[PDB]
């Protein structure tokens, strides 16, 4: 069993400095030794260096860094595609969540029937026409879903992106901070999600059961786990850019990762939005990074009963 | 779709200074804008000034400030009754919980078939003969329940009170610090409650289902939500006079408010016992006040899924 | 009902200084008054002074203080046996968990059909041949289970110990940090346990129901509750030697204890591994001690509804 680890130190999907140090923080929290201990054969691609784009002016006087986000994701997609083709499950360390454009596009290149479990406080599904921030880390899903493309204009640097995945092939877990246009999109296209309220009602066990029934109930499919650290309650993951009270507990996050592992289908994992500079203390940064490692390790078989 | 906001900066139901700054603290945490954003048409009555009573000696060498508490609640009931009479859902910001004598009396004056959801670590149902503290914020329910009245002596300043609500019309949620005579009262009058232990067993979804079955399962009734901030765990609401370990989580609190909103029957709400002076830090004070705003906003339609 | 309280200030089942002050910390947090208030008639045995053993060299160049742990547990077992013989429910305050060798042996002497509820982040079931630490507080169960005795070598100071419990007669709750050889032992001898993951799935009410079904579903048996304070999440019980993230909540711990009390069969209880010196602050030490008192008190009838 082989795992590729890719550092994607990208910050231009949003405006807060420091998320580009996420990959180093996660590495320094002991990721590689944790993965080896589970028996993973590891290939470390290091931290990628993304080609900058000169004069990357705002798109439509609103969307920030469109060409840089587009080119960095193009280059990342190529690495992910290559790594999956050589048989690695792909761990990508962010960096802001706009990198999912690249990891999912690269993943889907030769696994077009993949499915997506998006663990996040946010739906990240604004389009360039609905985003009120202009930050591409809050729009990545809009570029990936086939049903949405008549409503998604073409951004400079984005022409290489072919929407691959159907709206029936992504399930959200942990939502609690959704813009009204995103809520409209989720309803209008019948995208399935389990908000914190649904977890409050159902419990995380039934949530995972219904997630896998929706996605792999009829056939086995490679799973793409896109895990935004801010799905966890801010008391557990303070060092992140958009913290929202009322998040997953530690045990709930582990349970999600455990069930991901238990399918046997995990093919790529994003761990994004760890920003150590937003911690008010070194300890706050380290617990956030330590939590990111716990998620990744549990997703590749670390158990709580030994 | 109209909401009145009444500040009741009362502290004489108990002995700790500062709870009279609850209303200002909750307002400064952004309450009015949050209510407006939901579509509430707002009438702000400001903070009331209550008439002092000269020589308000202890009653029976035990009950403190009886006439002041009686008169303040008489005046508050007057304001609540006119606001409900003019079509407003009434939000009253405390202040100690003795002001529920006034808000429920004033509410019932216009809506006599109301029912009460009392969210609290405490039962607040001591009578003047069972209280061991003498503080009227630990007795408000005893003055309101019709079946208890033969055991409730008449206090100076209380003769205006018409206790007509039945013991079958109030349900408690969150109990975990109950005096032995309060436990006797709850059992002897078959008053229904969901303690923290019941929530542990049933889960908050079934707690709310069973609460509404008891109160509105036979007919629609206006709902009075009386919410003591100390129902929440002290880690979440530290700035309060009688914190008790092992309380509601944030998510459980939001879920209660959400189900209150979902009935469509919320007619008045109390948010009581925020005392910002008991915070050990400005952070603890603001967290408690922000939590209070979250409870109120969720009770009037704020969702976690947008 | 009569309760004996035995301080067992023992630290040589492990290497960290200060767990011998656990009994004094728990007493200072009000234990005796809490138990009296529940109506329990109290016999206080004080803190035992265990006989030292000169030249207590490592066994097999690994196992630390074997003769001291053997002899202290022999002396403790004698005291527990006498107290249980005299009709006391036995509360033993630790001290590290190697003292369960003594309390369970003494308890089993008069009550051979006793069953064991072991509440703990750890399984404590390494043998002298599987421990990687050499610390006897991580091995006590191996000396007590009949089915394991052909694989447990005899230690200096241990020859008095007769395995008294069958592997069907112990249930674990709270496991989350299990060594591979312990996991093998648990599965190979079909020892029943509820890990944190099981609690996440079932909820603590179902966990307790199944616990008692396994243990006393056929017949009434005296219950021995061996409660390692590190079963609780470290945010709640920080002053302990091997804290593990993702533990019991406060409410779950109270619920376990309440259900223990509700059987009416509690005959002895260990409250072990409070180490006040590992607190980074006086408050951290006191919160841990207060929690220990809450466990013991709820195990003997303290309720959350009064
Ligand atoms: N909907 C928002 C947006 O900007 O589109 C409005 N504010 C935050 C949220 C984006 C969160 C980005 B994520 O952290 O989840 O990668
Ligand atoms: N039962 C008590 C009483 O004084 O009657 C004994 N101690 C506090 C409790 C009252 C709590 C008042 B509430 O905060 O719930 O408004
Ligand atoms: N399995 C271990 C061992 O040393 O055997 C490895 N690390 C700690 C654990 C013992 C915990 C002892 B307890 O605290 O539960 O009394
Ligand atoms: Mn997010
Ligand atoms: Mn995201
Ligand atoms: Mn209260
Ligand atoms: Mn109250
Ligand atoms: Mn132990
Ligand atoms: Mn332990």
């Amino acid at each position: 069993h082989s795992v590729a680890v890719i550092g994607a130190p990208f910050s231009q999907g949003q405006k807060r400095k420091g998320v580009e140090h996420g990959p180093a923080a996660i590495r320094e929290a002991g990721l590689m030794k944790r993965l080896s201990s589970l028996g993973c054969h590891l290939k470390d691609f290091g931290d990628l260096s993304f080609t900058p784009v000169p004069k990357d002016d705002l798109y439509n006087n609103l969307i920030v860094n469109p060409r840089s986000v587009g080119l960095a994701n193009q280059e990342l997609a190529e690495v992910v595609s290559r790594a999956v083709s050589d048989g690695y499950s792909c761990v990508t360390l962010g960096g802001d969540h706009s990198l999912a454009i690249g990891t999912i596009s690269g993943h889907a290149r030769h696994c077009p029937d993949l499915c997506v479990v998006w663990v996040d406080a946010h739906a990240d599904i604004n389009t360039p026409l609905t985003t009120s921030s202009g930050n591409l880390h809050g729009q990545p899903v809009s570029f990936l879903l086939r049903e949405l493309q008549d409503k998604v204009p073409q951004l400079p640097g984005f022409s290489w992106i072919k929407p691959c995945i159907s709206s029936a092939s992504i399930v959200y877990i942990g939502l609690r901070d959704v813009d009204p246009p995103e809520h409209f999109i989720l309803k209008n296209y019948d995208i399935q999600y389990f908000s914190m309220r649904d977890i409050d009602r159902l419990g995380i066990q039934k949530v995972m059961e219904r997630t896998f029934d929706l996605l792999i109930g009829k056939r086995q499919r490679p799973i793409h786990l896109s895990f935004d650290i801010d799905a966890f309650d801010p008391t557990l993951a303070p060092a992140t850019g958009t913290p929202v009270v009322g998040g997953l507990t530690y045990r709930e996050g582990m349970y999600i990762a455990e069930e991901i592992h238990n399918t046997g289908l995990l093919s790529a994992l994003d761990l994004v939005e760890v920003n150590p500079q937003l911690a008010t203390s070194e300890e706050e940064a380290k617990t956030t990074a330590n939590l990111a490692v716990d998620v990744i390790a549990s997703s590749f078989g670390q158990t709580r009963e030994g």
Side-chain angles (χ1 to χ4, degrees), chain A:
Chain A
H1 259 279
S2 292
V3 178
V5 175
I6 306 172
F10 215 37
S11 63
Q12 285 170 99
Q14 44 85 79
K15 296 192 177 81
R16 305 191 89 173
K17 323 159 294 275
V19 71
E20 71 270 32
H21 303 305
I26 295 171
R27 288 167 192 280
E28 172 46 42
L31 174 61
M32 295 318 273
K33 305 244 198 82
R34 289 283 282 285
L35 288 180
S36 306
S37 282
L38 301 169
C40 310
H41 298 58
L42 296 174
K43 179 180 188 178
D44 188 349
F45 284 77
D47 291 11
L48 302 189
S49 281
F50 297 114
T51 309
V53 182
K55 209 69 172 71
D56 189 12
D57 295 330
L58 287 184
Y59 173 77
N60 212 359
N61 287 309
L62 180 60
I63 313 306
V64 193
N65 315 126
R67 301 159 194 79
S68 324
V69 169
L71 182 47
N73 277 301
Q74 187 172 35
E75 307 185 325
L76 177 53
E78 194 61 49
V79 177
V80 166
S81 183
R82 185 175 342 115
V84 170
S85 79
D86 298 320
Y88 294 99
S89 304
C90 284
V91 172
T92 302
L93 313 174
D96 71 68
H97 218 153
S98 73
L99 300 163
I101 293 167
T103 71
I104 292 170
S105 303
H107 197 179
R109 202 156 280 164
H110 292 102
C111 301
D113 197 33
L114 67 76
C115 62
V116 176
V117 179
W118 194 284
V119 182
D120 206 321
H122 313 89
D124 293 4
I125 202 171
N126 278 300
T127 83
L129 304 179
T130 74
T131 174
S132 67
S133 64
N135 300 328
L136 284 161
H137 77 153
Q139 307 168 60
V141 177
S142 74
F143 304 99
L144 302 172
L145 296 195
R146 296 197 304 261
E147 288 82 354
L148 270 60
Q149 293 310 295
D150 297 329
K151 301 232 177 300
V152 176
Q154 168 140 314
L155 278 36
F158 274 57
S159 69
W160 65 275
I161 295 171
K162 325 167 111 71
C164 34
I165 265 54
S166 83
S167 50
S169 299
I170 178 170
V171 172
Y172 295 90
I173 303 168
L175 297 190
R176 60 191 181 275
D177 180 11
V178 180
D179 300 339
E182 297 178 289
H183 185 269
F184 175 87
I185 284 164
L186 293 172
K187 288 314 190 180
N188 189 75
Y189 299 94
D190 203 32
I191 294 161
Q192 304 303 301
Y193 57 91
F194 300 89
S195 77
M196 299 306 309
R197 178 173 160 87
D198 294 308
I199 302 170
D200 291 338
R201 292 169 54 82
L202 288 167
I204 195 68
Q205 165 182 353
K206 280 200 179 61
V207 163
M208 295 317 300
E209 281 168 5
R210 301 187 175 193
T211 295
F212 293 136
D213 198 66
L214 287 164
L215 295 175
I216 55 172
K218 291 322 184 41
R219 67 195 185 269
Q220 301 282 280
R221 304 165 79 184
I223 291 179
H224 189 108
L225 178 64
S226 201
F227 202 117
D228 186 329
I229 203 63
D230 72 19
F232 284 108
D233 193 79
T235 60
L236 304 170
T240 195
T242 315
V244 184
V245 66
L248 299 170
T249 66
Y250 180 86
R251 290 156 56 177
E252 280 167 342
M254 296 305 100
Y255 189 86
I256 292 165
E258 282 163 0
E259 286 312 293
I260 294 289
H261 172 69
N262 282 339
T263 69
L265 295 172
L266 180 59
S267 173
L269 181 159
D270 314 318
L271 195 300
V272 303
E273 296 282 355
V274 172
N275 183 346
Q277 297 190 355
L278 299 188
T280 55
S281 74
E282 212 46 61
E283 200 204 328
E284 272 193 1
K286 284 202 284 173
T287 84
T288 304
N290 287 335
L291 180 59
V293 172
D294 286 355
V295 168
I296 304 182
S298 186
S299 297
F300 288 95
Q302 181 155 336
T303 79
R304 282 175 288 166
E305 69 182 60

